[PDB]
């Protein structure tokens with residue numbers, strides 16, 4: 249079980265961390281959702297599906313910078329929605345394929361009442377998401393740490 253990003257970076261068997269760089273809608277109004285779809289950025293696979301079943305959760309997601317300050321968040325994990333920043337670990341998604349496949353996570357972020365102007369700055373850390381991986385084979389319990397960075401400013405009109 250390993251993962252890779254669209255940016256070309258990767259995290260190998262056993263876990264670790266990597267940086268993810270996302271383009272964001274440059275203008276977002278109060279009452280609108282800014283979407284950060286990591287499912288197009290983060291992909292994982294099972295290295296031995298002939299024998300082993302891999303289990304994957306979103307263990308925890310934290311908001312940083314302008315996302316923590318200026319937005320109200322929901323995270324969608326495999327069709328289900330949760331508070332973001334997260335209050336609990338999600339149920340498991342099953343990975344039974346060697347073809348690299350999306351980690352099904354999306355952030356839905358809507359401006360708070362006090363947001364206005366540049367609510368997210370380019371190059372700033374906006375989130376950390378921890379993918380947790382186990383299996384039905386042994387005692388492996390690994391963390392894949394995704395550091396999410398803004399590629400561009402996001403403006404909330406006033």
Ligand SMILES: CCCCCCCO[C@H]1O[C@H](CO)[C@@H](O)[C@H](O)[C@@H]1O
Nearest residue numbers: 249261262294295296300302383388
């Ligand atoms: C002839 C025995 C081969 C033994 C191969 C074990 C491979 O383990 C890796 O790949 C497994 C399948 O993705 C993961 O469940 C496990 O955590 C680790 O990432």
